[PDB]
Amino acid sequence: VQAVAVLKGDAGVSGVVKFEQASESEPTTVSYEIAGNSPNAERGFHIHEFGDATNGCVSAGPHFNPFKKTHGAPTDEVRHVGDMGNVKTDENGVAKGSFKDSLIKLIGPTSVVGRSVVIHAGQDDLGKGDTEESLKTGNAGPRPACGVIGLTN
Amino acid sequence: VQAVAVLKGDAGVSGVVKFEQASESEPTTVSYEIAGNSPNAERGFHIHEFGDATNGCVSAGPHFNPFKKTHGAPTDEVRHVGDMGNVKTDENGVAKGSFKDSLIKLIGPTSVVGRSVVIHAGQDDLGKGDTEESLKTGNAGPRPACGVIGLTN
Numbered sequence: 389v390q391a392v393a394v395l396k397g398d399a400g401v402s403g404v405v406k407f408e409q410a411s412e413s414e415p416t417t418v419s420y421e422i423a424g425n426s427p428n429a430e431r432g433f434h435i436h437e438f439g440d441a442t443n444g445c446v447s448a449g450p451h452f453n454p455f456k457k458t459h460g461a462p463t464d465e466v467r468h469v470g471d472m473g474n475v476k477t478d479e480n481g482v483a484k485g486s487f488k489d490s491l492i493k494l495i496g497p498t499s500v501v502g503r504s505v506v507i508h509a510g511q512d513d514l515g516k517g518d519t520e521e522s523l524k525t526g527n528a529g530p531r532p533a534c535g536v537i538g539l540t541n
Numbered sequence: 542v543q544a545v546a547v548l549k550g551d552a553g554v555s556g557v558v559k560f561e562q563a564s565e566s567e568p569t570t571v572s573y574e575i576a577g578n579s580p581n582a583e584r585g586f587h588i589h590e591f592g593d594a595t596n597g598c599v600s601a602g603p604h605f606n607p608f609k610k611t612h613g614a615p616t617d618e619v620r621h622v623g624d625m626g627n628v629k630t631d632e633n634g635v636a637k638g639s640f641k642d643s644l645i646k647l648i649g650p651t652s653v654v655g656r657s658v659v660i661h662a663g664q665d666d667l668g669k670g671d672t673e674e675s676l677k678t679g680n681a682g683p684r685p686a687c688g689v690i691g692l693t694n
């Protein structure tokens with residue numbers, strides 16, 4: 389199965405995020421290319437609950453968290469399913485890369501198809517900040533761009 | 542279950558299409574409000590296969606047709622699952638309305654979540670034109686606006 393989200397906004401940030409998962413048990417490969425970010429920075433990157441774009445990136449809702457855990461890093465045992473950590477931007481403000489994740493799925497009851505990908509204007513503290521907020525959003529800040537995850541071939 | 546698609550394009554057409562289905566067996570209620578169309582006209586309205594917006598509305602692909610039937614009207618027994626017929630625009634070029642459909646579903650193997658809604662620049666001939674094209678696209682023409690169907694609450 390393949391899916392794709394086109395990130396759009398009014399802040400100069402835009403990009404494309406691709407997802408690929410063969411079977412439900414296999415890890416999903418996430419590949420992204422995002423431009424217009426601050427250069428040489430780390431930016432919060434997550435899958436939010438709703439694929440609702442009626443109110444910009446606001447209507448995307450909170451981080452996808454069907455298991456009701458706290459916010460963490462992708463490598464943490466305790467994390468939201470949608471937690472993809474920070475992407476690093478280069479000297480030209482481009483974030484490009486890929487990774488495999490075992491919690492994010494395109495198949496099954498926790499499928500992210502129809503939900504949203506959100507790139508933030510700030511750095512995700514990975515739930516390590518000493519604030520209640522750190523455990524909810526990672527203090528990643530505003531949402532300059534987002535897109536609904538759709539099916540593709 | 543509720544889903545929504547925000548129709549965007551570069552042609553001045555934009556809108557919102559909402560979907561609601563309680564259980565898989567129940568009809569899905571489709572409500573729409575689309576502006577910027579030609580006034581007092583009929584415009585093709587369908588669910589296309591892919592929720593891929595990487596190449597405008599082009600990457601949405603063909604009409605969603607898992608059962609491999611020919612193009613028809615929503616009331617035809619032989620139609621594509623994604624065939625929603627024509628929407629009528631008023632004197633101000635606004636198409637607003639709602640209907641219930643039993644082939645379009647948000648639940649199950651034929652779910653349209655993650656696919657696209659496309660509003661056309663032309664009238665759908667409902668598969669009644671005497672052309673091979675009539676049986677594939679209804680000769681509805683260009684795709685001024687489209688959106689990926691995402692989950693909402």
Ligand SMILES: [Cu+]
Nearest residue numbers: 432433434506
């Ligand atoms: Cu986020």
Ligand SMILES: [Cu+]
Nearest residue numbers: 585586587659
């Ligand atoms: Cu169409």
Ligand SMILES: [Zn+2]
Nearest residue numbers: 451459468471
């Ligand atoms: Zn989180």
Ligand SMILES: [Zn+2]
Nearest residue numbers: 604612621624
């Ligand atoms: Zn059709």
